[PDB]
Every structure is written in C-alpha cells, then in structure tokens.
Design a protein around this ligand. Structure first.
Ligand SMILES: [Cl-]
Ligand SMILES: [Mg+2]
Lengths: 211, 209
C-alpha cells in the first residue's frame, strides 16, 4: 500500500523485423505467438508495450533508498500459458474518461519470444496534445531475456472504484489517446541514457485517481 | 554538483483564437516580450514554457535540500526587461550538436510573451521522437510574478566538452527533439503527476549523450 519509487533508465527494445531501425518503440495490437499478459487467476492485463529497465534503484515514500521489493504474491507474467516472470511493483493510473494506464515491473524468470501480427506505434498530429495510437506498417517480434527486468505497459478503458485494481485485457487499437504521465518517456526511443522516477506499489493498489 | 528537481509540469493556458487554451505550444517568433535567458552577450532563446508546480529539491544523494540560491549573473528577460532569476539549469548535449536546455526560472516580474509564429510537435509512424512543425497561428503567454516556470530551448550549438552551450536562434520546423527527462513538458500536463529532472545550480551541463 505504501508508495515506493523506482528510478531507472528506460531502454527501447530492439524488435525483430525486416524494416527500418530495429531499435524503435513499438506496441502490440494482436499477438500471433507467446502472447504477453500479466495476470492474476483468470483476470489479465494485456501487455501492449515493453521497455527494458536498466540501472534500477528503489526509494521509500520518504525517499530513503530501500532494497528490491519482494514479488507481489499471486500475480505473474505469462507468455502464452507459461509463467515467465515475477512482478516486483505495480503502477496504475485512473485517468479521465475511464482511461487506465498500467505498468508492471517484471523480473523475467524465463525467456520469451512474443510475436506481433498487428503492431501499433504512437503518433502525434498537429491537433493532438498527447500521443495517439496508429497502426504499424508491419508486425514484429520481441526477445525477452530471462533475468532481465522489463516495464510492461497496458492502455485501455476500464471500470473501478478508487483503490480498486483495474484490468485491461483488451487489444490496443489505433486512435486511442495515451494521456501524458510518468511513463510517457517509455513510448519514445530511449537509449539507456537518462533516468525517470515512477511511483509504484508493492501491491495491486492503484495510485490516487487522475494522476 | 547535481541537484534534482521533483515537480508537476503544468501546461500554460495561452490566449489565442483557437481550441483549448491549455495546450502545449512552442514559439518560433515573438512579436513582443521576447523570452530569453541570458548572461551578458550570450543568450538562450526560450522556445517553450511550462509552469512548475509542487517543486521539491534533492541532493545528489537524494536527501531533501532547500531551494538553491539563484545562479549569479544569468537572467530571464522579456524584451530588455529582466523578469526572473535562474535557480537551476538543465542542459544535455545530444547526438550530433543537439542541445536541450531547461532553466528553472522564478519570475520577479510579470511578462506577456507575444508569439507571431508558433510551433507544435509532430510524430509520424517512422519518427521515433517528437519533431517540430509550424503552428497555424500565434498566441500569447501570461507569466505571473513569483510563479516558477521551466523555460526550454532546443537547437544545435557549438561547444567542446563540458562547456555550457547557447542556443539563441529561433526554433524552426522539422527539428527532432530527442527523448529526455523533460519530454513530458511537451505534452498536455494537467498538474497531476510528478517528474524528476537533474539540474545544476551553475551553468554546467550534464554528461554528454
Ligand atoms: Cl530496505
Ligand atoms: Mg491514458
């Protein structure tokens, strides 16, 4: 329940494709294989994008350095049906108009190869004030090494009272607006060269609403 | 040397003939109360501004510290009038000659920057960072005295290693703003989330990237 801060350098995953720079920020609409979820029982969060967490350090609510948290009990990262990682901390923001943003600090205990049939990128037109989703011009695949930590994010509309954990099992589709937030640098190309600080919880408890 | 600022970015509500007044805008040309942060002959042209809300400071060791003293001899000016102090300075030497500068400015007077030619950020499907584009009209900002603002500038500039760079030129279109700590200040911010940026209480840049 207490707020703990994660300071880390985001690092864009290098995707497997036949196009463009391999290191580019991509999101997943439809998976063809090793579909990425973070779930508790039947309830699942559909993972829409991933960045590597590099040089992480943790702080208490009072900004004293603390040790790595224990995994949140009973919540797991799965590729397909296989459990592939623990979850150290959870970030969830209940935004305007049922917008829900979830970020899991995932510590991989096994490798995974998520393959994306329909991809998504974030775009911004001259009349958008936030990033907005658009369709890839092709699919791709990710390679998630075991032992590495990843921030696995999800964006969608969901219901829930305040302090109720929300579940976004939906596909991410185009023209969905991702409201500015702490994790917004993880949606642009990140070259492991600057730190961000995000508030998290060692439980499945959301942050105070519209944040 | 390094000081951390934790704060909530807050998008300025501009006065214009368009859409929501609270939208993230950048300035290409000022018609009046032109925004610069300068020291002697050297000036940085201020390209965008956000209000700093709920600021707190941390040591390099993440112990809370007090508000730093103003950096001596550097001032924020609207036109020729000095209108603010500089508490901290953020500068990143990016790819090629890309320079990103952010000043923590505490206004000691009001200011009304008058922008004839505007700039917005773009992102196409094969852009991986925000890029600048020309707005379709101008606007004005209102900077209240006593309020804190982050005043940012983006451009290519010269300087050998560890030397503070000056970007005095107008910001133009098709300029790539590389991802960094201050990138949330380019999107709509509603005073409802915190970011942490590294700064210095001197005119000294961060380690080159
Ligand atoms: Cl501890
Ligand atoms: Mg959102």
């Amino acid at each position: 329940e207490d707020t703990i801060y994660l300071r880390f350098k985001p690092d864009t995953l290098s995707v497997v494709s036949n196009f463009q720079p391999a290191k580019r920020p991509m999101l997943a609409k439809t998976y063809s294989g090793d579909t990425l979820t973070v779930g508790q029982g039947n309830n699942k969060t559909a993972i829409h994008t991933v960045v590597r967490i590099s040089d992480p350090t943790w702080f208490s609510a009072d900004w004293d350095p603390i040790s790595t948290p224990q995994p949140i009990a009973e919540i797991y990262c799965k590729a397909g049906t296989t459990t592939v990682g623990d979850i150290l901390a959870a970030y969830q923001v209940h935004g305007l108009g049922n917008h829900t943003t979830t970020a899991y600090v995932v510590r991989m205990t096994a490798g995974a190869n998520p393959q994306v049939s329909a991809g998504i990128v974030t775009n911004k037109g001259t009349n958008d004030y936030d990033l907005k989703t658009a369709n890839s011009n092709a699919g791709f695949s990710w390679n998630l090494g075991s032992g590495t930590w990843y921030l696995m994010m999800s964006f969608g509309d969901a219901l829930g009272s305040l302090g109720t954990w929300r579940w976004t099992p939906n596909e991410l589709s185009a023209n969905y607006t991702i409201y500015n937030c702490e994790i917004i640098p993880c949606l642009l190309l990140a070259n492991d060269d600057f730190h961000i600080v995000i508030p998290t919880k060692n439980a499945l408890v959301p942050l105070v609403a519209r944040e």
